[PDB]
């Protein structure tokens, strides 16, 4: 029954996160962060919205979405680099 819709209000929040993740993977052995990886943030936001049975992707839903997606890329890094990206993405 639930199919939440989207409004492009948080576009700057997601786009800059996507750019930030790509920049930190340019020279580090890590996940193949691509367009398909950005789509996970939006789709996983839909799941959080679809948990509330709401019809709208709110700002909060993306907030849970971005934290889950960005943390995954940070955790799967070598020890010497993990502690640096810990603080580089503290905004998110």
């Amino acid at each position: 029954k639930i199919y939440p819709k989207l409004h492009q209000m948080d576009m700057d929040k997601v786009s800059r996160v996507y750019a930030d993740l790509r920049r930190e993977s340019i020279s580090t052995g890590s996940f193949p962060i691509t367009v398909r990886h950005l789509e996970s943030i939006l789709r996983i936001a839909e799941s959080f919205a679809k948990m509330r049975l709401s019809e709208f992707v709110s700002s909060y839903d993306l907030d849970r979405a971005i934290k889950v997606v960005v943390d995954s890329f940070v955790d799967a890094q070598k020890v010497s680099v993990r502690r640096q990206l810990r603080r580089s993405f503290a905004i998110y």
């Binding site: 199919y3 939440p4 789709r43 996983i44 839909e46 799941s47 959080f48 679809k50 948990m51």
Partner: peptide, 8 residues
Amino acid sequence: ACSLFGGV
């Protein structure tokens, strides 16, 4: 949890 609910 997110995979059980899925997306659109």
